[PDB]
Amino acid sequence: GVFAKSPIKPLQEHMDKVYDCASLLVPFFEATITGNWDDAVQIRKQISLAEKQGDSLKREIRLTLGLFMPVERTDLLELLTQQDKIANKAKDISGRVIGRQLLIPQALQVPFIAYLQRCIDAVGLAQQVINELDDLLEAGFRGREVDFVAKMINELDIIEEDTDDLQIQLRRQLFALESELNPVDVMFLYKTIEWVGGLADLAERVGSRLELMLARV
Amino acid sequence: PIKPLQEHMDKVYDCASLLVPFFEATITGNWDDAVQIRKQISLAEKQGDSLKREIRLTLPSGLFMPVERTDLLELLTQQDKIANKAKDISGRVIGRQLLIPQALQVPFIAYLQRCIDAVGLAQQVINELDDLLEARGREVDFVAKMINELDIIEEDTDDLQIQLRRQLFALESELNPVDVMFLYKTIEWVGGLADLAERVGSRLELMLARV
Amino acid sequence: PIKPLQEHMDKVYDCASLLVPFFEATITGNWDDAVQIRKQISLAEKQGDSLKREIRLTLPSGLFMPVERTDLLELLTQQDKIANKAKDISGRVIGRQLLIPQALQVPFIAYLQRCIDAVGLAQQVINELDDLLEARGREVDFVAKMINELDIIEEDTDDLQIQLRRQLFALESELNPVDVMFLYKTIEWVGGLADLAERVGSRLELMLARV
Amino acid sequence: PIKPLQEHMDKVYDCASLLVPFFEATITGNWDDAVQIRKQISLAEKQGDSLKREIRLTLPSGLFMPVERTDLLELLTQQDKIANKAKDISGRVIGRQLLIPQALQVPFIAYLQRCIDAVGLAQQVINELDDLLEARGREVDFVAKMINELDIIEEDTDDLQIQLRRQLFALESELNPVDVMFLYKTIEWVGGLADLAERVGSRLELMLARV
Amino acid sequence: GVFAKSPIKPLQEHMDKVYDCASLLVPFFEATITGNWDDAVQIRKQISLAEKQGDSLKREIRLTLGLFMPVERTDLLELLTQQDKIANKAKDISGRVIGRQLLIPQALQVPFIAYLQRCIDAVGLAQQVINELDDLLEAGFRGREVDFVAKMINELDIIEEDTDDLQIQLRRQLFALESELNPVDVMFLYKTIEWVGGLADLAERVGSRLELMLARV
């Protein structure tokens, strides 16, 4: 028996774990880049642990989600589903990299890390908006919802512009290097870039679900 | 979200409650004071109506909310009827300078108070509702309790109502027939306060069944 | 899901139906028997109330369901009023030992029976409802039929009610004025059984319009 | 979607409005004409009932729609009660050849007209509703206005009702007690036209709170 | 202050812009095929402009979407989301082609353009059904909805059959040519075919959303 909590709290705790999980991809890739595969394997164990922890929070929620409630149970589940995908993506990406001992070519290392970080920043915005949501639930009234969405869109546009530029730069550099590499490796590098971008796509879906919830009120 | 409804119910209860000292004044022949108490009843009704107006013009503006706007409006409508009923009853009594016959006085007041008690139960359940909103399965216990408490009040008011009508029946031959009919109407109107309170509980119950 | 409501409606119909032999007893001066029949009426009401309580404390616990929990509760509330009305009417009649004047006796019973018939139609539609639930387009035919059947009953009860009031009016000068008013009230109360039955049909109709 | 409801409300208003010339006929001792006017009242009620039947058998068949089918049905039910009330009142008056005492005649007609005016407000809001449907935030102004207009009508009808009952009370000793009670009942029934109109507004308000 | 408009009108105007955006892929690819990369770049600027314009209409709708209304706000948003993806797909595809100066092999040029056009035709059907929807909203009654859906399915089956045949033909010809090409280019040609097909998949989702809306009434 604790004090009253938002119906959104368990979702926020899940998002926080997910973000921690995705965040670990930076040091994971940084390890792969210095050639320390033993450390990369240990960081992947941290990713796997965070994903397992998220999965437990997710199970808890699915078997618990309720009487009088200010949001739809189904919207919370749909939100949980998208958040969960982010942690699985991070686990999957890191697994494929360990699996192929995939080395990001020297010339692409700096921009790749910048791109990866900006994609993780998108997850960060998703975390931010899910936390900022208590403010609307605790207070809120016809209108404050519109400002919230407008802000969310402004912040996502900024992140998308940067991630789009970095993704182009990265693909342009890879394209210049193709002739120096094995074609299967080349394809897996493009796939890695795409998978990383998927972290940001998934984060956008989180925000879309929030937006749909706000549009039912 | 329930807070403004609770404030309105409180005002409505205060309005209806004044019927006891109102009637007590008439019974001691204090018509000047009964007129003053009716002024307090009218004021409470007017204040209630203001709270009602504000809720009606605000609720629509509500965003995320744990109960239906429409359920709150329906609840408000039922609550409001109670204050209006108290105002109407008191006005008819002043208008006819209606005298309760001596032998009915004590049981009439006991019956009126028990009908008010029914309004009190409605006030109590609307305030206990925060507990359910602030905190599945608990809704059934809450409804079981409200039903238990209402059954107790209903049994008592039914007995009192029977007793009172039996006594009036015995006296009819000593009274003017129009006066008699107005005495029966007064008993019926007072009973209506309890019927309206029951409706408030029903609306709460429907709200809880939607979750 | 409709089954418990059907069981309750059946009990309610049985309760209201007892008003015919109740009144027939009073009309033959059998006040001891009318008291016994009123005991059966009270018992049916009590049993109905129990079924009501169980539904209210269960419905909330319902999972997947083809009708709204709230519609079932609203239906239950209307059905319950019918038994309560029968209990109330019979109690007032015992209380005043109310005698229907000789010349009104036959038409009064015919009118009461026709009002009961309205309760019977409600019972019939609530039972025919399984057919619609067990099996789009068929809902319109069902409502067209209920309206047709009710129009027939309403026409007959309107005529009887007019006839009965016309006869009482002709007799007023030979009776005590309070007794007269109670005779008009009794006619009105009996008519209310049909009004309540109509409300049961309306709630069914709303349920069907949600689909 | 609101159009058929508007047509029905218009018919209902026409039906209730005929109570003024109906009563005026009785007051000038024109019982043959009052019977003819009651025939017009019955006809309007019958036409209203037909429109009602068609809506009930059609609404269900509706596809995409900006309001709830159930809200429209509930609105229709309340509107219909007004025509039925006018028909019932007029029938009781013919049946008893009820004479309003001379001194109450003018204020009675003023009171009846003001109660009709309440029906008129309902008719007006149901027609202004297209404006809201054809075109967020505007719903609050619409409800604020309806409340303002109703408060004005209610104040006037309350005053008239008080005046009329005060005058009847002063005359009771000169009249037959049953006749007196029927005069009070008539005043109450007429007031009910305004109560029903208020319910029509409430249903509109609930519809607007769902959006 | 104009005359009454359908709640669907702003969605129709967005769909129209989206279709215009996707449509530009034909002349875009036609330019790449004659080897005029300067013109292809200029046509991509037209695609990018149409996507930016759509994005503004989309923002407008998201910050506006309402009182009494014949459809669910959330269904409109979900519809908008799918329509938006079509314009982004067109912008993304054209960007990758400019990025790699991707040349469709001679033998595949004619069938590729036919396939691309038929995929754009699917978008066209989506536009058609969104416009035809006013008819159901303006009139409509239990039943007219079923004929609408049946028609929609018939028309989509026809387009799907053709696009499936063209996609097979195109892949079969590419497969015969693989030995003459660089393997990375080969993979990007298959990807291009897939991305183009995605225009039709997205269009189908638009129709699915409409179908779900009709099923709530």
Added chain:
Amino acid sequence: GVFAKSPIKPLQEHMDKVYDCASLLVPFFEATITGNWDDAVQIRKQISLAEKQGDSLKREIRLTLGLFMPVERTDLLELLTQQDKIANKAKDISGRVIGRQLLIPQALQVPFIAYLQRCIDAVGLAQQVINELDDLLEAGFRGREVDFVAKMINELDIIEEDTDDLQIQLRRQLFALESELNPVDVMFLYKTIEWVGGLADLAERVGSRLELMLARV
């Protein structure tokens, strides 16, 4: 005029057809592995037939889906949509294999068939839960729903663990063989593995939809 049937029955009959369709992939691949392409073509004709049959059941449902009903029409449609994708996936996969006469390398044959079978088992669980759903609709009460979901999650976790292990093993073996193969073939083998896994992903979505339905009650 038959006896009363669950609103879920037509969906169950569709799922059954879908499962039959996906199931045919085992003998289809087994034929491709013994080198009997004539038989593989005949088995694909059986797959195509099952998909066409499913498509007809689907059309029937879409043009029929109702008065009083214990579930949302829209949830049934959304469920149908996911089930349909499984049959299309099976038809698409088999078509690409016939198209390229794609041979699974000897060393990967046994594990590939095991993996394919376990993915089909996921479809099997989806079929199981859709059939078990009548039990909840026929009886059921606040609470039995939670046990149903908990069971579903337990069973899916088991299948996912196995499919994840088999997928890793299979990719690890392919990675060891890459140097012996044409790079385009290599990419298509990875794609095949991914597409097969997609059968299980689609099956999971079926279960997610069921879970959302149960969460509205």
